[model samples]
Target: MGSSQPRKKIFKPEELRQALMPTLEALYRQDPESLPFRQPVDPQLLGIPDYFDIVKNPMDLSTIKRKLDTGQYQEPWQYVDDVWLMFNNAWLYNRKTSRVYKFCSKLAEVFEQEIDPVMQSLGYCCGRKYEFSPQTDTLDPEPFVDCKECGRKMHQICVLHYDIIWPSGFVCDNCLKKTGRPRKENKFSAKRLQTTRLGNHLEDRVNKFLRRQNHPEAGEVFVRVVASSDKTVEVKPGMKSRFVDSGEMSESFPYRTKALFAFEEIDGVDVCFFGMHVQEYGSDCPPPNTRRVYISYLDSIHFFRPRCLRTAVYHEILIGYLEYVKKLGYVTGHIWACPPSEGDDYIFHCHPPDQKIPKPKRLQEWFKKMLDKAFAERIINDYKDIFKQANEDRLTSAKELPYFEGDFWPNVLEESIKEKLYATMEKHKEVFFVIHLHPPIVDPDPLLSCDLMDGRDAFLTLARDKHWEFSSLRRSKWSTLCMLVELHTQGQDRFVYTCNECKHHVETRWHCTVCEDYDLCINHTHKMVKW
Candidate 1:
């Protein structure tokens, strides 16, 4: 019904402005929810420390308005691109379930519907189509290379696509163009950048997932996946050794490839570097077509705040990392569960002397408990039965145990049990096991477990029904819990008191026996009392 010919009309920048102004005005007056998108995001104010790092090109409606007013728009598509950038940035920074993200999605739909007809009338092609090149197995996606000359970074694919080859000390397209040089006849290979690119991709995916989960310290936590070339296990100086030697297992598997490191940022500095090694064994180990991955050498230092290093956070990160490895075709994963040595106080250098750190035995018990919980929760399969049978067989048949053969006996189990484990592993093609080396997945309490928002809503509802004057409580989980406890236990046996020093509500306060109604919170309880 429509002609195939593209509409051609020469329009000035003013004409483009006339069409976009009304749409912008309508969006501004739509709702109060549009406040977030009206201006650029302030990372400090939002408490999102890494917002600028993740969102490289941030745009906003205010910036677009300023650009339009200054006659900066040369083409109509440029204006559309800025508007889309604003919407895309919102989508990228916020989770889909967030209020800001939902509002942006709706606004984007409105814009598309309103502008399409106007663009058609102005002889402009508003429908933008993204054409992706077919992904080939041989070449890695989005390989990055630094120019040896100018130090400018660029995509290797773009450089190669331009037919520019500089095998010796790789130079970027910009540097090559500046200095007229003939192509050198050297074998061009961008395969070296594969590991780095893959590592970055994994980090991006994990971080994005963390954001989606509304993690409390999502911006402060960073995941780094790197290729480990060194086969030796060398402990850093001044660091406490936490893992046992895995020489026998290493000899059997031999292929040690990747390591994932997780870091926490504090006061603009990246502290508390912790990581686990991912090693792979050959396909013909126990079962055919099954890839066995051994996760070992889980280590960390106590540099970050202890409250932030919760077990739930570690579980979330591990789940994200394991999900990625699962996509990469790794079926079976084994975690070493050895606890730290006693008197290894190097990890607690930052902690106060009176702080109660878990004992080595207690740490082991907690680690196993966490693994058991994971198994019960269906996060990982239990392979302990096979190991238990293996230990029994070793005890019964001492002669057949072959202790002289090597330490491999401790790792590998009895024939029938081993076969059963392998069979299940092959059948499901997704299994995780706990072996002997351990990592710190410490803090027992869940982070931000108390439903503060729900409590606030309930409190407001109660206040409305009872006709009570309710003052705004401090915006904290502990504060909300204290207020709720006080409200629920009014005139009861239990009573909540406010700290005379800090003026904050205290659920548990130390009362001065000699003084009337004199109480102090836990922090100020250490103050000496004068009679």
Candidate 2:
């Protein structure tokens, strides 16, 4: 048996460095795969773009470092006190084991330059803050806020006044006064200092402010964190990055909140304080083929590392801050399905709330136009396929487990089978033929009647396998995924080519005519299917 005495240790900066040197060394030598979710050159689901994507070279390196280094980390002591409220998702009430607290309690109150003025308008706004999905704003804004009853990303709470019915309780003068509207606030940009009260409080008056913000009467005095006109990237030709002119690309990067949070009693009440910087995105943004938030979840997950924790986290903070931001509604799989980020051409304005761009919606639409709508649809379809099982509840009562007929089969009928029956049947026939369905649970889906084209489809398969004779055509991979443009050539709205050899598909390029591309020699193969 061990004594109950506590253990203690402390070190100065350099001494601390010497003590933690092995952790750094081991990390440097650590195989990324040894971590949770990492693997080799995955061509299917893509990885993040490198440093160049978000920034240019060493400058980008510094930006990422500063952004993450200045990001918020989770608090331990305070986390325990308010964590129950943070994660007590009312929706989780319907869960099987009431495990809502489990995934939630694990969360620490993250400290980021982001997240100010958590909303008390809802049950969650107990303190000045609560946990949020790190990706909320980075991935998409929709998940950040919602109506408590409808479960939407938008909400409007009436103040229950005596006089007239007005829109949202937005007093322009009040807002301007709070943020010093006309002055320094205008020049502020994202990842830049805003002289936030939260900063000062966390530095000195954190306990006092936490008390006031959580006070029962702290109504209307609070505000949400939101982007101002300044966060917009200038649309002028020279101002926009030249590389953003075309292709899929993202503007964000990987983020991680690594602060250890704990609650501490301050002036008689337990208060929470978290101070940590998030990890930074490399300079590179994902290409046009790179995924938008909802479309490519890995990239989206990467997008949110510094934004929020889950889709739900973002929704709460966002909804609470709705007065500060505008609701643009859902963009659907098409927006999220985009493979990579792309530069905008200033069509429909895609700006969030309070953007300076005129007709912002039109600008965003214009940006999408350059991306080729067909490709966008294709990519959204990709997302549907990826998360389909969970979202779709693809399983019914299990009469039998689903199986892929051609690809997998059991070796023996060992379960619940009498020896007499097992001795008489072959494995393939017993197992494969027994499955009631023709296709497996999660396989390429049919569009109305035909299959959607993923990597396995003929057009993609033959092209990928290089069964085609030419090198350029086969090698010219998806330079960009679904973008938001409608690329047209020679006044043609859509292009249609035929498969001269097998009725699969062909671009029938002027180049193809010259090359006569073929996977196998025409003379060597016979007609196996009708066109």
Candidate 3:
């Protein structure tokens, strides 16, 4: 048993330092994982000081002192608040119970700055000086005014009239009851309802304003609750709680009030209160002081006349904020996918540095044009060598080169030509080769197609024009099929050569006329079907 006596202790700045030094020393030396407190708190998640072994440097008064000496830490109060937080955390964690606690309370009230009059016209006064009552129901004028409804000289009841109508005027309670025009309902952008007269009498709605770095509204919302008529209202444990006992339930149905709130610009908050009682309830009414407010909710109102405009403004603000963050050296990592098959607008993803790597497929397509000189010269020699070897085994005709079919695979030919192709790239690295598509996605103009020579004839012309042997004939998909030959000759005169077999004019030096009775054009290679 313990005596019911209260005790308090106070310490000066240095005394607070002396108190933490020993604990800091021990924490620095030992691992937090090794020793467990009764109920531990995660300092890292809370952005508080941590003393885990994984920290690279010792987190002691010495390190903090160095930070101060180096001008990294500008305020002594920062250190003070942190020290007190650690002490309180350790003290509470030692209690070994699942108890909720506040690190600090009533530190101070925050006020709005650079107030906007237009916003104030809506809810700014209630939002700014929210410590005062938000109930702006009526105005007691010395001289009476006529209600738009009953047209009587009485108090002018306030109602928020957002809809554009002719000749707006105040209505009395009696006349207000007859119409539905001045009712409080959730309007566009107005999702919260807050008042300073109820539970807020103790704490200002200004205090309830959640501060945020980016949001213009600062996440302000109104809260309403469903009250109970009975004081001894039984409660059930929530899903977030571990304290739910077996088979717990509410004993009786809770009482409720149907709010017929009329909409108005009470404060910046969107509010509407009916003149008379709009709710009918069951169950005995709870005592006035004992009556508790329940079923609370937040409300918000926007100045945008239409809803979609407000949504657009929201997206604009968010995207603008993200762009601002990007300018501040932070990556939002935003990438949109856009398929070329779609319309003009599209999206694309930017891969992080690691995903970029070299693969042979694209390399062949990329540097294939580099093999131009070798393809027109050396490749012809390789073909001659194959034919020479074939002729040694058996007599082969000059035209038989295309049908030789032994090492015609693009891959095999590419491997054989790559060594020589290396030299071509260094010589003409400045040029870009865009291969035409086969069965092109866009059809070639009829006149253009008619003017183009066949690929083999064009290849022969390329070899003749470039003065190089046919290195290799690469027919793999290079964006387009080889229908016509085109080359960047770098100021060389292009002469048209005629193929003896096809009797067609092409640009090529690749012709086989070795049989005394033979005439073979390079165009014969196109008959391979697959090429």
Candidate 4:
């Protein structure tokens, strides 16, 4: 009767056996979904939460590297503390960010103004702006602008600002073949356990289930239906009644899209009509007053740069409740299928920070918990199981798979932006995350906050006139600032290092000790040490 009573496996024994092979095949695809871990809480860790008065020091590269290479994950934050710990900080960016790479700075500047007054009224700014902004351009693509810095005409591009923050970019299906030429790892006949995707379906793991006594890995998908009301904007009572009347969602109906399904609680809000329509945020008051939904297909996680998961949460979905099913919050099952196509981090899926009341420690623990859960439930349970049984399907671990990786480049809001944009963020701290990262397309269903600057629209005007989706996001490509590694290799590992001179991180990677010869960036510092 307790929540911990071992939840039954959803699949029947025969179907459970049937699904294992596909799951194994999926893991072999050299995709993001195949990784051993899920991305947690975030690069947002770098963002100091409001409640804490902690001062953080900058990261020292040498220390991080030493930890990673030795396979020692002890005190991962021995590196985490330095990176996420808050330190004396200032927000600044440059025209180089826009007039050049991904014209977002200008767009970011434009967005800040639009959201300011609303947040000010909400009383969040406290007379200051949050040094944060979400790029509307992620996994999915958006229109681009002419970069003054480069002769190219692309607008949104994720570049690696720091060595660890893998830039968010895509590897084109075409490019993956052209560059990766993935000459079947000549050692294809290796005698190893073959795994298939079916083995990894959202079913019960026999091994885990048998691991015996009411174990924690046995998770139950919680579905709490909420009636629509001003105080509780969860399941739309109207929608539920409609489904029941139509016999669409009867337990006899089996799970189908149009038929009402359910989602776990989000910020105490009920998510009904599961995996499709938007769920109301906070108290979902019905129409006339408007209900809100937060659509985030990926958990907010960044590295080496400052990120606030809450800001990412607010900005990505609440900013503008876009219509259409925008895939929000954590995805239920089957994430390992999508490979980074671009990042080296072995873990591909992302998850939000849970139980994070403030930031830093709360966020860290939450992220750690989410990852711990996923690994036990999905990876170790489903992946390892199927992979071990399917010996024939086990191909030799290729040196590399078609992978692409980078960071959200074009540095933070510019220093020059400090005057105008700084004041804008200062004004809208409460909901700037909500309003920021909105594509510049003109809204068909007008948003509450319109662009403040003249000659600019809150939505992309070009969206109607041109192909806004960049081939960049969904596909993979290389950049001057990224370190792409094959997934089967040691990609997700991170480490710390110190500058020989001042012992400072020398975030850049050279030494004042021998300034001339070792000017390589932090990423390349290993070669110097090797030399």
Candidate 5:
């Protein structure tokens, strides 16, 4: 039958659908238990409120048929992907023990078996052989390679899509599943320690300050700095009496610590102590003389009788701590000025539910004013000149300026001017202060300047930390430097192209011609491909 059917030069969507329909219908006829696989799931009727959230992309046999009939699928693989997606969605939404899941498993196997010959008759490969190449802007046919483990011949793209590529050779997905060989661990896994030289130094400084003040709780309070492996470390309310896990580790910030002040008792009552979470950027490969310190969280109990006194004492301790860190070589300091949300445990536990904390706008202004006062007192240097220059430039080139509606205070300036100002700042690291009116939802901007001497080391560290998959084009030091430039100049969504996977603006994008809307950033292109 295969020899009788001749391979066609051109693809016809209607003809392809006609060939696939017999196999699809045969599965339904053979297995009446697979009735649920025939149509789209009605999530609302099923009383599954979280179905949409769990399944980002849902598919079914009926939907695939409709798309095939309407010429929505240009390639043979798109149809195949929809089928796989239907089964994948079922697996995701239902437990393995469920009847629906078992039925889907049975039906998927039947479909694969029945459709293989049909697809072959239509001149299509067993595995994905053709895919859109953005570089050539064409449907490129990938050569088949033998799988090292299973010795199965599969298309290069198919092997990449469904299998693990080892240093030895490609291992097909089936073999990988059966063997259960563990994937190599990420090189950037968190390396957390109980203590370090820097931690000991900070602890000693804080203890000395407490002793000098001759405060009533001086001896009772012992400060300890512990390294953190978390993305966001919140010192929950009542942390003084109990321990709270720091939460999930993230690769965003490699060097972070939670400085805890354990107070035995305040005025004969067990009271909450201060918990400060600090992130030090450029610590892995420290720049010549500059580093950035971010104060993510600073919270303490209202111990002092007067509000003014409590604020003053806390502020003094914080300022002292900053000075010690600054002297140790971290010159740049950033503080997100927005007040805590009502949902925040610190805010809810500290005040009555009915009582409102200050608005974000008012709090931003207050923080700026306080920082200005500190700058005037020579407690900290001012870095507001760049912001002032940016504002002036904005007034002069009003029409050319980008929209800054939702931006943090001293909203990012024009690119050229920002570049020049950042270069100057890098040269003089002592003049550095940044205050964000909004919470830092993205990575901190104006990253520490990459020193040429240590640039490669820093790049390697970051690549390892981010698990960056380096293509031949992006393996050079110049490429790393260019990426840093792109990262600094173009904040998340300012780039020309957006990554479909991460859904963030990216400087470099990998386009898919088959799927017009599909674009992937370098990271996503190597790590995550939907098809």
Candidate 6:
């Protein structure tokens, strides 16, 4: 018997099954949901050192099913939880043992792959913010970090720690406040996530889980400007109100009220009020440290604008609101239109007694001063270059051409040219991509004088002399073309044309060459060519 093994502990089939019962029962109680991959462990098998080694390698479903198939009773789903946890845990352990190991699909990889996609599917997240906290049953059983101050070990999410604010250290709560003059002044106090409220929630995603939780109750100040209306804001059959949230968001929790009155135009060339809040929210005795009301239009993406931004019917609404806001109890703020390159991009605050009143006419005058002729011409030149690049053989303009469309009548310099341009765009949609040639609300009259015009004509003529079609004649709409369009549409075409030159000399040097009796006027070039 020198090399003989001692008799192993003999057990009946029932005894073996009974021995595994505690493990299965404990694992059944643990939650798999909190784990990012939704895998739970069997409590009895999880802590038992001997059983842990059994799942060291990736365990398959048939192996798990075979082990749990007998004794008390088992089903298809009964084997699922144990098997999943076994595979995931094995993968995690293997990753730990090998410093340079390539990780296969497991909890970490699964969470990374699906988190953003899952978040995005639950829309209304854009421009919104979110605050998160742990549910009652989510306490972790394992240690995530060791406290630097007291050497206490605990899960990272279990306690507020220093790693949150500063990097690379963990100081538990008890030790943090123990030597504190005050929490903020103490070096060991737990860190907090900073917020600007301007950012979307995704930037705050991971910390919302890792950080300590807080109570849901909170307070906020609401500032409202009451505008007397010709009518009230209401939801109708085909109309619904969309919030400041953008399509980029995946959660809709935070964005409450982020809108500001844009100084930019709502629906026309002039900035105007579009709509008002009838059920406005504001109080007389406000919260401490509250600021005044401010308004500004959102940038090009249309995130924030007057409510009736695209509506022609409610163009007058914003003007009324401006008057109402001017009389508001809160302080006022505005962005005055200054020169493009001017160093005046800021919110000008007005205090009580001299809060800026909304005087429409005077405000318009100041706004006009902000619009410089040189700057306008520069923008026009930039557009011309871009147009040449995008579609030299194409043409585009906004769906709205001012005098040609909407309530306005057409008094185009040449109706035939307008008609032909429209037809060409339709026929050559491939080249134009159905884009508008006329830039929106661009009043070109501020820039083009005889000096710029003749120079443009000479450039065009030089190109045309080299067989660059329409490269000879130069014409544009702004003050010159703009007035031509506006006044003529208003039944001033004949009179305006007569004032420019004698009717008999309409096709002469100073007159437009494109508008005469010829099939196509060569003087007013379309600024495009096709091979």
Instruction: Tell me how far the alpha carbon of residue 100 in candidate 2 is from the true structure, in angstroms, after superposition.
Output: 37
lDDT for each residue of candidate 1 in 106-168, tens digit (9 for 90 to 100): 888778877667655554334231112222123223333545664433433323322223326
> Model 1 compared with the native: what TM-score?
0.31
Ranking by TM-score: 1, 5, 6, 4, 2, 3
Report the C-alpha displacement of residue 429, candidate 2, in angstroms: 30
lDDT of 6 by residue, 1-531 (tens): 353224322335465445444433433333442232233335364454543554445453335435654532232222333544554554555555542122223333433333323222221011111112121223222224555554433433223222433354655455557757234432311011111211112113212322223223211111111111111112211111121132221111110122221112212221212112111112221221012222222111111132232221122223223233333322222222212122211221101122233343454443333222212423111112123432464424421221101011122312333334454324422211111112111111111112211212332233223222110001110111121122123321122123232333232224334432222222344332211
Specify the poorest-scoring 10-residue window by lDDT in model 1: 469-478
Residue 262 lDDT, candidate 1, scale 0-100:
57
lDDT of 5 by residue, 1-531 (tens): 342223223457777777767876865675666688677788887898888888888888788878878888765667776787788788778998998888888877787787677766654446222332222013334445555654434554322321221346665554567779754432211111122344444445445555666665333333334223323222223321222233222212234333333222333322334556555554442221125566655554434333333454455556555555555556556665546654453311222234346676665565565566456646577644334534444433222211111212223332333334344334422222363211112222222222321212333344433322222211211222233332334322222556777879866556775553467766723333443
Candidate 2 lDDT trough over 10 residues, lowest sum: 479-488
Give Cα-based local distance difference scores for all models: 0.47, 0.23, 0.26, 0.24, 0.47, 0.27
Instruction: For candidate 5, give the lDDT.
Output: 0.47
- The number of residue pairs in model 3 that clash at the backbone is 47
Write down the lDDT that model 6 would get.
0.27
Better of 3 and 5 by lDDT: 5
Query: How far off is residue 34 in model 3, in Å?
Result: 24
Of the two candidates 2 and 6, the one with more favorable lDDT, higher being better, is: 6
* lDDT for each residue of candidate 3 in 1-531, tens digit (9 for 90 to 100): 853213212234454344333333433333332132212445676564643433322232345444434445322334433433433444344344422222111110111122223223222121121111111133222122344544323211122222221236544443445575654432332222222122122122222322312334332323221121111322222311311143222232232321211122223533211111111112232221011122111111233223333333322222222232233222211111111221111111111122222243443343343233323423211112222333344633222211111112222223343335334323432222211110101101111121111112333244333222111111011101111112111212333556567787555435443321223355643222110
Per model, state how many residue pairs clash: 6, 90, 47, 86, 0, 25
Model 2 misplacement above 4 A: 1-270, 273-315, 318-385, 389-531
Q: lDDT tens digits, residues 1-531, model 2? A: 863313212223443233322322332233431122111212234443542343222211123223233332122212222322223321233254434223322222321111222222212222223221122023211112322222212211111111122223223223346557432221111112222322222223223334444544221111111111101111222211422354222222221111111122222221211111111111121222111111111111111111232222222221221111111111122221122234221111121222232253443343244233323423212222212332254433211122111112111222322224322223222111110000111101111111111112322233223221111110111101000011111112233455555655554322232222333213233333222
Runs of candidate 6 exceeding 4 Å displacement: 1-25, 28-145, 152-168, 177-182, 185-216, 220-531
Off by over 4 Å in 3: 1-63, 75-81, 92-278, 281-531
Report the Cα lDDT for candidate 4: 0.24
Expressed as tens digits, the lDDT of each residue in 1-531 for candidate 4 is 543214221333333223222322322242332221112212356453631332233222233333334434332212222211211111112134323123323323433443334323322221112111122322333333222222222222321122133223322222336467332221211111112121112112322322344443322212211111111222223333443365433212111011111221222211111211122332122221122232222221222011223232222121112212112221112111122223221211211223122333443343334334334433322222112322334423211111111111011232222334334323322221121111111112211111211112211233223222212222111111111121112222233555554545644564444333233444423334432
lDDT at 65, model 1: 90
Candidates' RMSD to native: 27.4, 30.6, 40.0, 33.4, 23.7, 30.3
